[PDB]
Amino acid sequence: PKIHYRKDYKPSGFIINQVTLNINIHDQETIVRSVLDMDISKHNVGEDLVFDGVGLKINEISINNKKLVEGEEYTYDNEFLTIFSKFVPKSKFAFSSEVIIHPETNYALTGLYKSKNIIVSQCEATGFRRITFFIDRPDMMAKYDVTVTADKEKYPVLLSNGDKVNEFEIPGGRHGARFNDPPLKPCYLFAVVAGDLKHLSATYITKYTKKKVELYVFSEEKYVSKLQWALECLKKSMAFDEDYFGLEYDLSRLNLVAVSDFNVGAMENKGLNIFNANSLLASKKNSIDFSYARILTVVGHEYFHQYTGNRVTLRDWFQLTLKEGLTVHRENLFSEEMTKTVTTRLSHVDLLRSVQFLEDSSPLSHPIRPESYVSMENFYTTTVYDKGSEVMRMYLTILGEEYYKKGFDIYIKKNDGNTATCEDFNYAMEQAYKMKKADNSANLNQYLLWFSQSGTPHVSFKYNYDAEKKQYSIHVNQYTKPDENQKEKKPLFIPISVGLINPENGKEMISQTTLELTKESDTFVFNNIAVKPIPSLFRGFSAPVYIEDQLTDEERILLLKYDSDAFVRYNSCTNIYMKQILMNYNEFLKAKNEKLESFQLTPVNAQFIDAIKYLLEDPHADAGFKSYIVSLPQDRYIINFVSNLDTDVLADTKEYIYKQIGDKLNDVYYKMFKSLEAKADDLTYFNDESHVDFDQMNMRTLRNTLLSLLSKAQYPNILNEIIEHSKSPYPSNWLTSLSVSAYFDKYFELYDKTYKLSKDDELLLQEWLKTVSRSDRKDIYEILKKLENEVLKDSKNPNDIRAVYLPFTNNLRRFHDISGKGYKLIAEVITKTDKFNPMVATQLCEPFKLWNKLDTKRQELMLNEMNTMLQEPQISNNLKEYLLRLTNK
Ligand SMILES: O=C(NC1CCCC1)N[C@@H](C(=O)NO)c1ccc(-c2cc(F)c(F)c(F)c2)cc1
Ligand SMILES: [Mg+2]
Ligand SMILES: [Mg+2]
Ligand SMILES: [Mg+2]
Ligand SMILES: [Mg+2]
Ligand SMILES: [Zn+2]
Numbered sequence: 001p002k003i004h005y006r007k008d009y010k011p012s013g014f015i016i017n018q019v020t021l022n023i024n025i026h027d028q029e030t031i032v033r034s035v036l037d038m039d040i041s042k043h044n045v046g047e048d049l050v051f052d053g054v055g056l057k058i059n060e061i062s063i064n065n066k067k068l069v070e071g072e073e074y075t076y077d078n079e080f081l082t083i084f085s086k087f088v089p090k091s092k093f094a095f096s097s098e099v100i101i102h103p104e105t106n107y108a109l110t111g112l113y114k115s116k117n118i119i120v121s122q123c124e125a126t127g128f129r130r131i132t133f134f135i136d137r138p139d140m141m142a143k144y145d146v147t148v149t150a151d152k153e154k155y156p157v158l159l160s161n162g163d164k165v166n167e168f169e170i171p172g173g174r175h176g177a178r179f180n181d182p183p184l185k186p187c188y189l190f191a192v193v194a195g196d197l198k199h200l201s202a203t204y205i206t207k208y209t210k211k212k213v214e215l216y217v218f219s220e221e222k223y224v225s226k227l228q229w230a231l232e233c234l235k236k237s238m239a240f241d242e243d244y245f246g247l248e249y250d251l252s253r254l255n256l257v258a259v260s261d262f263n264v265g266a267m268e269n270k271g272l273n274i275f276n277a278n279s280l281l282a283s284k285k286n287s288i289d290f291s292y293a294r295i296l297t298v299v300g301h302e303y304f305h306q307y308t309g310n311r312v313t314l315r316d317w318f319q320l321t322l323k324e325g326l327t328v329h330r331e332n333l334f335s336e337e338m339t340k341t342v343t344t345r346l347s348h349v350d351l352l353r354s355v356q357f358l359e360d361s362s363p364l365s366h367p368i369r370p371e372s373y374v375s376m377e378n379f380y381t382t383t384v385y386d387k388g389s390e391v392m393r394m395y396l397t398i399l400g401e402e403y404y405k406k407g408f409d410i411y412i413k414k415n416d417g418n419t420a421t422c423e424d425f426n427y428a429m430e431q432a433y434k435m436k437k438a439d440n441s442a443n444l445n446q447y448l449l450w451f452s453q454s455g456t457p458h459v460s461f462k463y464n465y466d467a468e469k470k471q472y473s474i475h476v477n478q479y480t481k482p483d484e485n486q487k488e489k490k491p492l493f494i495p496i497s498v499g500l501i502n503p504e505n506g507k508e509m510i511s512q513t514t515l516e517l518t519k520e521s522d523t524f525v526f527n528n529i530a531v532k533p534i535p536s537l538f539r540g541f542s543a544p545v546y547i548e549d550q551l552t553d554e555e556r557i558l559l560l561k562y563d564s565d566a567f568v569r570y571n572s573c574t575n576i577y578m579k580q581i582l583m584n585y586n587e588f589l590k591a592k593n594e595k596l597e598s599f600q601l602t603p604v605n606a607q608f609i610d611a612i613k614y615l616l617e618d619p620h621a622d623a624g625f626k627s628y629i630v631s632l633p634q635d636r637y638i639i640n641f642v643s644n645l646d647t648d649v650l651a652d653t654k655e656y657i658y659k660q661i662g663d664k665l666n667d668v669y670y671k672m673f674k675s676l677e678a679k680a681d682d683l684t685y686f687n688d689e690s691h692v693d694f695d696q697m698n699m700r701t702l703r704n705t706l707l708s709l710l711s712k713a714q715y716p717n718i719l720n721e722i723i724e725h726s727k728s729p730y731p732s733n734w735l736t737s738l739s740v741s742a743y744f745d746k747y748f749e750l751y752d753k754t755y756k757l758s759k760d761d762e763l764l765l766q767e768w769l770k771t772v773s774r775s776d777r778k779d780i781y782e783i784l785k786k787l788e789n790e791v792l793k794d795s796k797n798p799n800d801i802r803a804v805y806l807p808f809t810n811n812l813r814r815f816h817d818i819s820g821k822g823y824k825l826i827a828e829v830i831t832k833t834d835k836f837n838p839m840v841a842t843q844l845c846e847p848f849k850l851w852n853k854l855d856t857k858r859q860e861l862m863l864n865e866m867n868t869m870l871q872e873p874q875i876s877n878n879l880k881e882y883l884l885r886l887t888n889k
Pocket of ligand 4: 297328331
């Protein structure tokens with residue numbers, strides 16, 4: 001089982017200068033002919049020529065048009081093609097091969113595969129070797145000349161990278177297209193698509209060079225009416241890179257293509273971006289609101305890769321966060337600017353502190369630049385992406401916009417057209433840092449620990465105020481818990497964006513200030529502070545850390561009502577909730593453990609409830625923010641704060657807290673649910689796919705959140721509102737009506753009604769599946785069996801499988817049933833899926849990531865299922881590696 005080590009990087013002894021491909025698609029097989037124009041590098045020491053090549057059927061291989069003979073001149077073991085060095089030329093040579101591959105039965109969706117009636121490739125990370133022989137690593141840059149042939153009736157649209165330079169007819173009903181892509185690229189950015197594709201198109205004129213760029217968005221004919229928003233998002237993405245970063249697209253054409261079967265969200269193949277259909281296609285009649293932000297961010301993400309990933313690429317896969325963390329950061333800047341809603345940034349933090357913090361305290365914890373890997377298909381993590389993005393964002397917080405832009409342009413200008421490493425980016429940021437500090441001795445050497453140190457830092461505070469001196473002190477310390485990657489953790493460069501709120505009038509007491517904490521602890525003193533402030537700490541969530549604000553709930557309430565920073569307001573509310581959750585959890589736990597006949601629960605703080613009401617009733621306050629304050633923190637956020645978490649006790653705790661607040665605020669909730677209707681459900685632009693109103697969607701989020709609270713509470717006659725909600729044209733509304741009807745006798749009536757509305761659109765049906773999966777039903781196990789028999793069946797579409805099972809795994813009371821029946825069910829799905837798609841099988845392991853944080857009975861139950869999966873004789877490399885790491889074997 002080969003382990004790759006970051007420190008072992010060495011340049012290849014070979015060079016591949018030119019790739020000339022002929023991909024001939026036939027009904028039962030695909031024939032790939034490839035000529036590689038190669039050379040000997042300065043690092044060559046006379047080694048064998050070893051190509052990656054996985055699952056290829058060899059028809060012939062040759063060197064300089066001389067056919068090589070198996071056994072004598074080469075060996076092939078279905079993974080590596082080895083040409084013995086005595087037969088390898090010593091100067092420039094041509095290697096050629098013809099192989100047979102089978103996209104029709106390629107259900108792992110890596111390499112060349114068939115998704116419904118579309119032939120499509122996915123080559124990142126090491127999938128190109130599943131198409132033809134190559135030295136499959138991103139520092140092997142080459143030019144590509146690609147011809148694709150296929151039946152014209154089945155595959156009229158042929159696409160690859162670069163310029164289409166010829167189209168030709170072929171006897172027997174076939175046709176061909178030739179694409180030449182002169183700029184050097186790594187092979188993971190190669191792509192090919194063939195299908196009966198329909199499109200929308202537009203022309204974009206770049207801001208400075210005034211180049212005309214042809215934009216094409218493609219789907220199967222059935223869904224061509226769902227392409228409009230994606231095209232709008234692409235234009236928006238191009239304008240943002242031009243306006244913020246001064247970067248223009250360099251090619252004459254950009255194609256985006258939706259396919260139904262895709263392992264992840266989308267892929268940035270040069271000029272030919274390929275998308276999970278659920279991340280490219282939408283219409284107002286057939287998509288929930290979430291689709292619109294999803295398409296915006298994913299289209300943006302792939303577009304921003306054209307510079308951060310494509311034009312500046314990776315030396316090796318250990319640098320993955322250099323392109324993914326930086327592109328997520330660019331994507332997040334873009335989405336924040338396009339949506340103009342504070343909930344966009346809040347939603348990113350909420351994901352980080354639940355999913356990524358859980359990963360970072362799990363046995364899977366790794367730094368954003370790991371030291372080793374076995375499976376590249378398991379390398380694409382929320383740590384690499386989302387903690388990576390926060391590390392990339394901290395440069396902007398440290399430098400400010402002007403110097404960040406200066407440093408970013410240094411990075412692009414110095415590395416355009418080349419591979420790069422994380423050091424190259426830190427170096428560019430350091431040059432800007434010296435400029436900002438006016439100090440050529442300043443350096444960012446300490447910053448590099450963000451790339452190598454795993455785990456979430458904890459930052460805690462103590463305060464002092466001298467009223468006579470008007471002097472305020474913030475004493476700060478940082479700590480990262482030792483883990484399996486570093487026994488000793490070093491202090492990081494932590495930027496702490498801070499404000500000081502005057503508690504008497506709510507006003508700012510100092511200018512914008514970013515404290516630079518570079519030691520294990522430091523004391524920051526402020527003079528001329530006229531009154532004792534309430535500190536507003538880590539504004540905008542300025543570092544990816546556990547914040548221990550050491551504030552009272554009275555102080556947190558004051559920030560929640562009156563602070564200027566949306567994150568600190570949201571975090572102050574989160575912290576009030578967490579204090580209550582931990583207190584009530586321990587009270588319920590003690591009652592369970594001691595088998596008490598009576599006991600007391602500490603009520604929710606009444607001033608906190610008053611503050612929620614105050615914000616809810618503020619007509620100038622933001623609807624999306626309102627929906628966050630009436631929602632308790634995510635379960636996966638809570639679990640980072642409780643040892644041996646009993647999920648039933650936590651479910652009882654949340655129930656008590658929601659009921660406490662509802663018993664006071666339900667009339668407020670109902671009144672708002674009714675008063676929000678007119679603006680939230682406005683149909684003026686329902687038939688304009690170009691008109692997307694993120695504030696209006698946030699109003700629907702608030703209505704649907706309040707409806708959930710009111711339905712669980714059995715608010716008088718709320719079933720009438722649920723039924724009327726089911727008649728709304730907006731899928732977010734009528735799918736909500738299904739979810740909230742779980743608490744009423746009408747659930748299966750609405751189940752059938754919404755099924756009928758959903759069944760004729762592939763993506764809407766998947767949203768329906770998710771809604772059923774997450775329904776708060778006592779009979780959810782029977783319902784899942786019904787979905788399996790009636791809808792899901794033996795589909796191999798990852799979107800179908802993930803829709804049926806993942807939402808259910810977030811059902812705290814039912815997935816964690818003490819019998820272990822939920823763990824048994826998901827383990828059976830994982831093992832079944834692993835037979836044909838190991839990457840998605842490992843995705844389905846997600847609920848097990850917290851196994852060692854649960855109560856000892858549930859730890860044992862989860863471990864038993866993971867050991868059962870590990871004992872499967874046919875377990876994939878992906879799944880075995882993942883479960884061995886997760887179970888500390
Ligand atoms: O969609 C995404 N979602 C993110 C969210 C948190 C982690 C993943 N990530 C994109 C991306 O970064 N696009 O730019 C992406 C991720 C993985 C692959 C990939 C890698 C492989 F080894 C394969 F075998 C394969 F089939 C696919 C392709 C694209
Ligand atoms: Mg094969
Ligand atoms: Mg413009
Ligand atoms: Mg995103
Ligand atoms: Mg299907
Ligand atoms: Zn990406």
